[PDB]
Amino acid sequence: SQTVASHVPFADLCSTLERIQKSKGRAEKIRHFREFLDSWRKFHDALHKNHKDVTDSFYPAMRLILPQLERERMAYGIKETMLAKLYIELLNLPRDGKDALKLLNYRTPTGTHGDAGDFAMIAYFVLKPRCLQKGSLTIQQVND
DNA sequence: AAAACTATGCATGCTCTACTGCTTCTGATCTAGTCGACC
């Protein structure tokens, strides 16, 4: 029961999403998405040459590209505030430190750096010096 | 009549077992806030 999702690094999907976001018009975004889809379909055809009945599809990447349409998964129960709290606890950052305060009151523009309304940007800035440069996770592992 | 052996009461030290006070862990309650989904 081989699945293409187990052979696709998550970094590739992240890079594709970043390229789509950092695009001017619809044409470039559609081109990038179509290139990714064609690569996935070619890999699917190559992998499943012999097997007859296959349940493998593009769902593993689709459920991440469009999280709002996910129905199989239940509510995560965590939003910006809970995620910031968990990041503070796990990273062992000081409670009263600058990073923790920035993460908690992310809407306050007191920082004057990055973005004062996008929590993901601040999380990325905080984690830049505390995280490696290359990942080792696949789409299937992230879904699990 | 004098000397040697033995008995018993009290002093001394040590060790072991209740009782009171201080410190720390656990449980129960309340109050404040967060997340889900809809309209």
DSSP characters for A9-52? BHHHHHHHHHHHHT-SSHHHHHHHHHHHHHHHHHHHHHHTSS-S
Say whether A138 sits in a helix, a strand or coil.
strand
- 10 Å Cβ neighbour count for A4? 21
Which experimental method was this entry solved with?
cryo-EM
Distance A135 CA to B26 C1' (A): 43
- 10 Å Cβ neighbour count for A5? 20
Contact A141, A7 (CB under 8 A): no
- Cβ A78 to strand B below 7 Å: yes
Which whole-number Å values give the CA distances from A36 to A29, A41, A89, in the listed order? 11, 9, 36
- Cβ A82 to strand B below 7 Å: yes
How many Å apart are CA A6 and CA A110, to the nearest integer? 43
Q: Residue A48's closest CA among A7, A101, A105, A103?
A: A7
- 10 Å Cβ neighbour count for A104? 15
How many Å apart are CA A140 and CA A1, to the nearest integer? 13
Nucleotides of strand B under 7 angstroms from a protein beta carbon: 33-37
Q: Look at the alpha carbons of A12, A16, A17, A22 in this order and tell me if their dihedral is positive or negative.
A: positive
